[PDB]
Ligand binder design. Structure first.
Ligand SMILES: O=S(=O)(c1cccc2cnccc12)N1CCCNCC1
Lengths: 353, 18
């Protein structure tokens, strides 16, 4: 067979240890899920420094804690705008997930609180910026470099899926690089507790699984599809399915055809054909052997999964870092006020926050 | 080339959710 006795025993033991870890992690998650933390700081504990990101999702600002001098990334949501955009449940659920999960590649919510006008999530500051920027700058990542990031996503989804959390928002724009060169996943607005199927059309065109496009009930296998898109884009510098307009992208996604750059290794192409599999009965991550079909694939043969988890692997790339508040890996944005009204707004809606 | 096609798509920048 493919493994002799020693290798088979070691792999089996490793896979059983993953099960044991995940069962404990689920126990710990569910305790915090059922009893969420609230109101662990306040606005005047922090100096506002700079806007790190802004969009329909709200704002994220670099802030400095006045007493420790520690920097953080503070997501600010306008309660009235959340209500207007019908994002109450997503906003509450994002914070509830972030305060309950614990994994080395998931951003840590250090504090959260609200005031008359806004909701605030104070997360660790991840100074390296988005993978997206580095990828577009360098062009493409070599296979070992892509593999280092991909392994972190595999482990993170293995963790999330064990908690029955579907992620749904994977793309380079949503992956940050920390000071040690490791990945941080931050955005949980599309994540959902789903043990079975769910139906919402959400995501980003290039990363949508065919079953989402086709208006099917779908499951955590959409995250494994998205991983295939991500690995492809990291290694090629462009995603597998693109076009001028989303509808043309969707036609390519559902077609069952994907083409690869000539520099992709055969191992990489084989993995990608099995992740970018339109047939759900054949997609890696959706079969009887679960995540192990991915983790045991030849393309990952050099990956020491425990060493990645323990953050003991030397990263291929360390972003430039000049100090605790350096923002050079983020874009510049016009700076807007943080208005706090004298009157409480939307109090009932956000009781749980 | 595929790269040139990517540039031509106009979708080389940050991509929003649907
Ligand atoms: O970089 S963020 O502003 C950001 C969010 C959360 C925590 C962060 C921590 N450090 C820097 C930036 C952070 N960002 C907003 C949405 C777009 N995707 C990437 C996350």
């Amino acid at each position: 067979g493919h493994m002799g006795n020693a290798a088979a025993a070691k792999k089996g033991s490793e896979q059983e240890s993953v099960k044991e870890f995940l069962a404990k992690a689920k126990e710990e998650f569910l305790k915090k899920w059922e009893s969420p933390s609230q109101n662990t700081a306040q606005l005047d504990h922090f100096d506002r420094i700079k806007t790190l990101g802004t969009g329909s999702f709200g704002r994220v600002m670099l802030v400095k804690h006045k007493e420790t001098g520690n920097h953080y990334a503070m997501k600010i949501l306008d309660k009235q705008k959340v209500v207007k955009l019908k994002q109450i449940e997503h906003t509450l659920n994002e914070k509830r997930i972030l305060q309950a999960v614990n994994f080395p590649f998931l951003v840590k919510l250090e504090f959260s609180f609200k005031d008359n006008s806004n909701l605030y999530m104070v997360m660790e500051y991840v100074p390296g910026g988005e993978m997206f920027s580095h990828l577009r700058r360098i062009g493409r990542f070599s296979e070992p470099h892509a593999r280092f990031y991909a392994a972190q996503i595999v482990l993170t989804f293995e963790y999330l899926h064990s908690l029955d959390l579907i992620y749904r928002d994977l793309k380079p724009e949503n992956l940050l690089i920390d000071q040690q060169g490791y990945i941080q996943v931050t955005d949980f607005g599309f994540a959902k507790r789903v043990k079975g199927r769910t139906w919402t059309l959400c995501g980003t065109p290039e990363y949508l699984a065919p079953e989402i496009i086709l208006s099917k009930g779908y499951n955590k296998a959409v995250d494994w599809w998205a991983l295939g898109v991500l690995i492809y884009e990291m290694a090629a510098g462009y995603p597998p399915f693109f076009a001028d307009q989303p509808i043309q992208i969707y036609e390519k996604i559902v077609s069952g055809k994907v083409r690869f750059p000539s520099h992709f290794s055969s191992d990489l192409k084989d993995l990608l054909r099995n992740l970018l599999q339109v047939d759900l009965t054949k997609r890696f991550g959706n079969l009887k052997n679960g995540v192990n079909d991915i983790k045991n694939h030849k393309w990952f043969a050099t990956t020491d999964w425990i060493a990645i988890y323990q953050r003991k692997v030397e990263a291929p790339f360390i972003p430039k870092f000049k100090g605790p508040g350096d923002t050079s890996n983020f874009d510049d944005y016009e700076e807007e006020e943080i208005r706090v009204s004298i009157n409480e707004k939307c109090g009932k809606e956000f009781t749980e926050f | 080339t595929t790269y040139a096609d990517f540039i031509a798509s106009g979708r080389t920048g940050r991509r929003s959710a649907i």
